[PDB]
Design a protein around this ligand. Structure first.
Ligand SMILES: [Br-]
Ligand SMILES: [Cl-]
Ligand SMILES: [Cl-]
Ligand SMILES: [Cl-]
Ligand SMILES: [Cl-]
Ligand SMILES: [Cl-]
Length: 600
């Protein structure tokens, strides 16, 4: 049956991927494998039951640990990377806690692999953490693997996939060549000699209490002053235009913020959790007329904004503004600026190149925007944009270096980019479609231009041209033609619906829906007695909302506000702007954040 969509509606819930948390299937013994959504996802959420830390929701080591517990009654110890499992000489018995000797068997030897063994993939460029799975079965020319975070389909059988097992000249080699442009060969597998499987349908064992999870340390975000002895004089590459424009706008004992890992996890979980919460509320807003009114969206744009919502469920960037209190441990989110990507480059790149220009870069501390570029290539990869992408900005260096930084990411995943300052790149063709000067019809637009500016330019265009108007090649292309043209299937990065979560009117909605959430401040459409007592700010819609206040603590006399980035659908990094009096966007210093990693 029928569809008006000519180009297919896009989304981040891809085909051949079931949603986060859904069961893909069961390993022999009834061990559930859960979907991690897609292969770059990180929930930041621990899986814990009766004080037993199984691992991170749903990453690969988590399935191994849970599986080994259910299947052989053994507790897999803590390991930084999946690949480090292959160097393990012993695991623990869940009851006695005593050590249990494992046997490392290597791939590509005269030893045939066997079932109920932990298969381990090595560390490599495009899989730098490695991987672990479970051999469930072994045939004459294949093995079967059960795992998490490799394939995201619904399991047909009792394993995620089969893998080739080569046998030549008396040597057995498991090869993973499913995708033959990314062939992979596991180190080998661990076996557990003398420990029989538990009877299928047996209940889960209970663990010795001394094997409970240790409460992790408190999150901290500490301002520190550095003693640099190895300084680089000129550090930003002027050949990379993004770095060049940035230097052209501003200029080339020092200071920074240091977080521990736990603070970083809290941001990943809180940010990811808030993203879902904002999106949910957006659906509420979209399906309600009364609310579209409340958000000051003119009624003439309701069908188009609803189109946007149904058609394009993909997006590239958004930023939460957090405050963090070291004493109380509280993170609180003010605002989700989900439609202007301001300071992506600072957080994504400049921050790290600054650390490298002083000696702050080490093995033990990692820049808080490490994942931005990888998650930004993924964002484009799964965005749904194919073919050319026009990057449209104003005559301001900030927007250009932002655009270019994204264009790089886009181009790295095979999308053709074209940077467009103002609108003289574009012409109307014979049939009234917007085209670029190579004669290519506009398909995908990334932009800094805001939708409110577009709506305003629209109503001007109406008066200045008349309602009877229809475009022709003699007509010049305005902002509204590019964003609010007759072509509604153009993919926009940041889609029109993105104004909804950025509107403060959504704040009471997300409070009412999820008051329990520790990052959410109380917000109302009308002033309550509760708020008169706790403190409040009267914040407008273009009437107004009332939002709880939150003490903003100082360090070395600096106030700090934290920017948390959603790139595509993955929380991807933090950045801090800093001021002794008032943090005021560009005019305030960017501070670099370093995460102190888990040295066991
Ligand atoms: Br039993
Ligand atoms: Cl298409
Ligand atoms: Cl994990
Ligand atoms: Cl390795
Ligand atoms: Cl409508
Ligand atoms: Cl006020």
């Amino acid at each position: 049956h029928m569809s008006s969509l000519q180009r297919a509606s896009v989304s981040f819930n891809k085909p051949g991927h079931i949603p986060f948390g859904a069961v893909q299937g069961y390993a022999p013994g009834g061990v559930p494998a859960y979907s991690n959504k897609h292969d770059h996802y990180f929930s930041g959420e621990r899986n814990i039951e009766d004080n037993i830390f199984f691992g991170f929701k749903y990453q690969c080591v988590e399935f191994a640990r849970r599986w080994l517990l259910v299947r052989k009654g053994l507790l897999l110890p803590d390991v930084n990377w999946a690949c480090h499992i292959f160097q393990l000489k012993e695991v623990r018995d869940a009851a006695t806690t005593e050590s249990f000797a494992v046997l490392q068997v290597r791939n590509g030897t005269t030893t045939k692999p066997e079932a109920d063994a932990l298969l381990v993939y090595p560390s490599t460029d495009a899989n730098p953490v490695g991987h672990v799975g479970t051999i469930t079965e072994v045939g004459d020319d294949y093995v079967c693997v059960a795992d998490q975070n490799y394939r995201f389909h619904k399991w047909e059988s009792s394993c995620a996939y089969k893998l080739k097992l080569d046998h030549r000249d008396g040597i057995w080699t498991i090869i993973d060549d499913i995708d033959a442009d990314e062939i992979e060969i596991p180190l080998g597998w661990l076996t557990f000699p003398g420990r029989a499987n538990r009877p299928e349908g047996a209940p889960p064992v209970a663990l010795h209490p001394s094997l409970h999870f240790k409460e992790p340390p408190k999150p901290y975000l500490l301002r520190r002053n550095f003693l640099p002895t190895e300084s680089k004089a000129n550090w930003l590459d002027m050949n990379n235009p993004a770095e060049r424009l940035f230097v052209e706008e501003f200029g080339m004992v020092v200071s920074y913020y240091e977080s521990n890992h736990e603070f970083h996890l809290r941001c990943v979980a809180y940010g990811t959790q808030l993203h879902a919460i904002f999106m949910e509320a957006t659906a509420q807003v979209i399906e309600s007329d009364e609310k579209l009114r409340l958000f000051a969206i003119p009624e003439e744009f309701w069908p188009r904004i609803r189109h946007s919502w149904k058609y394009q469920q993909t997006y590239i960037s958004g930023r939460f503004d957090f405050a963090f209190n070291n004493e109380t441990g509280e993170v609180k989110c003010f605002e989700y600026n989900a439609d202007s990507a301001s300071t992506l480059l600072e957080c994504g790149l400049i921050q790290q190149k600054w650390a490298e220009s002083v000696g702050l870069d080490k093995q033990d501390t990692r820049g808080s925007g490490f994942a931005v570029e990888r998650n930004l290539k993924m964002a484009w990869a799964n965005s749904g944009a194919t073919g050319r992408v026009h990057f449209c900005v104003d005559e301001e260096r900030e927007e250009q270096y932002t655009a270019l930084y994204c264009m790089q990411a886009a181009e790295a995943v095979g999308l053709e980019g074209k940077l467009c300052i103002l609108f003289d790149e574009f012409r109307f063709d014979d049939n009234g479609h917007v085209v670029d000067s190579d004669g290519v019809r506009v398909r995908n637009v990334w932009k800094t231009w805001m939708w409110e500016s577009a709506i305003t330019d629209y109503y001007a265009a109406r008066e200045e041209r008349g309602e009877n108007w229809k475009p022709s090649p003699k007509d010049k292309v305005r902002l509204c033609d590019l964003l609010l043209g007759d072509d509604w299937e153009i993919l926009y990065f940041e889609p029109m619906w993105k104004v909804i979560p950025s509107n403060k009117a959504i704040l009471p909605m997300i409070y009412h829906n999820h008051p329990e959430h520790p990052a959410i401040l109380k917000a109302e459409y009308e002033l309550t007695d509760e708020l008169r007592k706790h403190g409040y700010a009267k914040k407008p819609i273009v009437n107004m909302i009332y939002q709880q206040l939150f003490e903003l603590k100082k360090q070395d006399d600096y106030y700090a506000i934290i920017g948390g980035w959603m790139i595509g659908d993955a929380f991807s990094g933090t950045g801090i702007r800093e001021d002794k009096s008032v943090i005021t966007g560009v005019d305030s210093p960017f501070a670099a954040v370093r995460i102190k990693t888990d040295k066991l």
